[PDB]
Amino acid sequence: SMEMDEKDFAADSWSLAVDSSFLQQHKKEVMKQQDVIYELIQTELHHVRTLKIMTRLFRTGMLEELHLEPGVVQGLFPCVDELSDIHTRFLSQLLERRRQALCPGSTRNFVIHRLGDLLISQFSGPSAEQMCKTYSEFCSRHSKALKLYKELYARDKRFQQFIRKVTRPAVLKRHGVQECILLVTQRITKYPLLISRILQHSHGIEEERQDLTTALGLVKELLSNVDEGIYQLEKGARLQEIYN
Amino acid sequence: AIRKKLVIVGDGACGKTCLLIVFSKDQFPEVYVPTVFENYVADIEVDGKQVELALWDTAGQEDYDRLRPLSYPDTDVILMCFSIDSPDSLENIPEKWTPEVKHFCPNVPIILVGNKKDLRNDEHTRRELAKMKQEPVKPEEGRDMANRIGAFGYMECSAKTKDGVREVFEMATRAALQ
Ligand SMILES: *CC(=O)N1N[C@@H](c2ccc(C)o2)C[C@@H]1c1ccco1
Ligand SMILES: *CC(=O)N1N[C@@H](c2ccc(C)o2)C[C@@H]1c1ccco1
Numbered sequence A: 001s002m003e004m005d006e007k008d009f010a011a012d013s014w015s016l017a018v019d020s021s022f023l024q025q026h027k028k029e030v031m032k033q034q035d036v037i038y039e040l041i042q043t044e045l046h047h048v049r050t051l052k053i054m055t056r057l058f059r060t061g062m063l064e065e066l067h068l069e070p071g072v073v074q075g076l077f078p079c080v081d082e083l084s085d086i087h088t089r090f091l092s093q094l095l096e097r098r099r100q101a102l103c104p105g106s107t108r109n110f111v112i113h114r115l116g117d118l119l120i121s122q123f124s125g126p127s128a129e130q131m132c133k134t135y136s137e138f139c140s141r142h143s144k145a146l147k148l149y150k151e152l153y154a155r156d157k158r159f160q161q162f163i164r165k166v167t168r169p170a171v172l173k174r175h176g177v178q179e180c181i182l183l184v185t186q187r188i189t190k191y192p193l194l195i196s197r198i199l200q201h202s203h204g205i206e207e208e209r210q211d212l213t214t215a216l217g218l219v220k221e222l223l224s225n226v227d228e229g230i231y232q233l234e235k236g237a238r239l240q241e242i243y244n
Numbered sequence B: 001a002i003r004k005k006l007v008i009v010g011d012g013a014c015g016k017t018c019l020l021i022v023f024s025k026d027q028f029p030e031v032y033v034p035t036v037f038e039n040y041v042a043d044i045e046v047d048g049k050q051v052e053l054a055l056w057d058t059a060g061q062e063d064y065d066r067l068r069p070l071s072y073p074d075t076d077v078i079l080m081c082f083s084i085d086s087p088d089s090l091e092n093i094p095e096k097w098t099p100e101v102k103h104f105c106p107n108v109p110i111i112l113v114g115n116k117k118d119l120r121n122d123e124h125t126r127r128e129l130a131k132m133k134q135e136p137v138k139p140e141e142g143r144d145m146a147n148r149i150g151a152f153g154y155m156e157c158s159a160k161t162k163d164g165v166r167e168v169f170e171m172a173t174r175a176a177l178q
Helices: A003-008 A028-065 A072-076 A080-100 A116-122 A125-155 A157-166 A177-200 A206-228 A239-243 B016-025 B087-091 B093-104 B117-121 B123-131 B139-148 B165-177
Strands: B002-010 B040-046 B049-057 B077-083 B110-115 B153-156
Touching: A028 A072, A028 A080, A028 A157, A028 A177, A072 A125, A080 A116, A080 A125, A116 A125, A116 A206, A125 A157, A125 A177, A125 A206, A177 A206, A177 B049, B002 B016, B002 B093, B002 B165, B016 B040, B016 B049, B016 B077, B016 B110, B016 B165, B040 B165, B049 B165, B077 B087, B077 B093, B077 B165, B087 B093, B087 B139, B093 B110, B093 B139, B110 B139, B110 B165, B117 B123, B139 B153, B153 B165
Parallel strands: B002 B049, B002 B077, B077 B110, B110 B153
Antiparallel strands: B040 B049
């Protein structure tokens, strides 16, 4: 992550991020809505950062320092480039919406009144198709990635020393290889929980209540499609085991 | 320290996300209770042994039967959660959650946990349940269910007051070590 965005999302809530003289001018219902919108963006910022750890610390470090067999690194980090593009673009849009909403003379005081339209765009058309195909691929390769990691850690001493070295910093405590993989798989099922709670505090404007209800329906359709498109791959699985 | 993995399972209304947040945070969430839990690695010392306990939630995965099992690989301890203000969440334990956990996590200890124990003597809770011919889950109903499903043990807590929360995670660490 970049320092500018980390400081903007350092507080435990929107009500603690904004100045208290700005907070006091708003109704409690607006503060409740903004607190959940802030959590959505803060968790998306953390999710993009998990993907950057996977591509730039783990993936690139393995290609540059290790002598692994070709196609091994791809098995460990399936679809990470595609996933990083999808989520970095979505995050860019969420952060621009916040930036546009800032008061002149402030880098922290804002209210996002329109979010539903942005969530509909992300979870419909070509961008929904790309998230659906990418998560169907990633989640079907998840078990194989963990087993490949465990195989290399137990048999390759150099790989073992590499892992101990790059995961040693305290900021990486919950971001080892297997932890990053499960963090990515779990991301998509967080969206209906966050959107339903934003919707619960967005009844003031009927257009916004409608857009958030549409977005919620779109995310659930995507999750159901991803769930139905999963079939766990197994390294060295025989054809007979697959067609039975 | 040795690394152990904990996963919490249970219905959407069981309070599992709140339990993981209150244990992991440090300062109680008096301003905002987060909607979601990402992960956490707790540093725990139990009976003289130091353990790194990785914490995971299955909230959001309840309706997705093919995504949900991806949370199970290499789990060392399962917390099986139900809500004391929801006898329906207790009834879903033996024939929905227990067979799935025994299938994907064979020989992994399960601790059955009764969340929201503060609501056992709440007036609004008792009145709302009385309309549907129900009452808050009794301690003996929790123990008998834990005994019936082959649970390692039965524990109660309140994420709201923090009572019993530390004891649940210390016991889960001991269970993961056996
Ligand atoms: C993964 C993906 O992009 N798609 N899943 C589709 C679907 C419909 C029913 C099921 C089980 O899966 C729809 C969507 C798509 C759009 C265009 C081509 O595929
Ligand atoms: C899950 C749980 O035990 N709790 N959730 C609470 C809450 C407060 C506001 C909203 C939308 O939900 C109340 C209770 C709690 C409070 C602090 C710790 O747990």
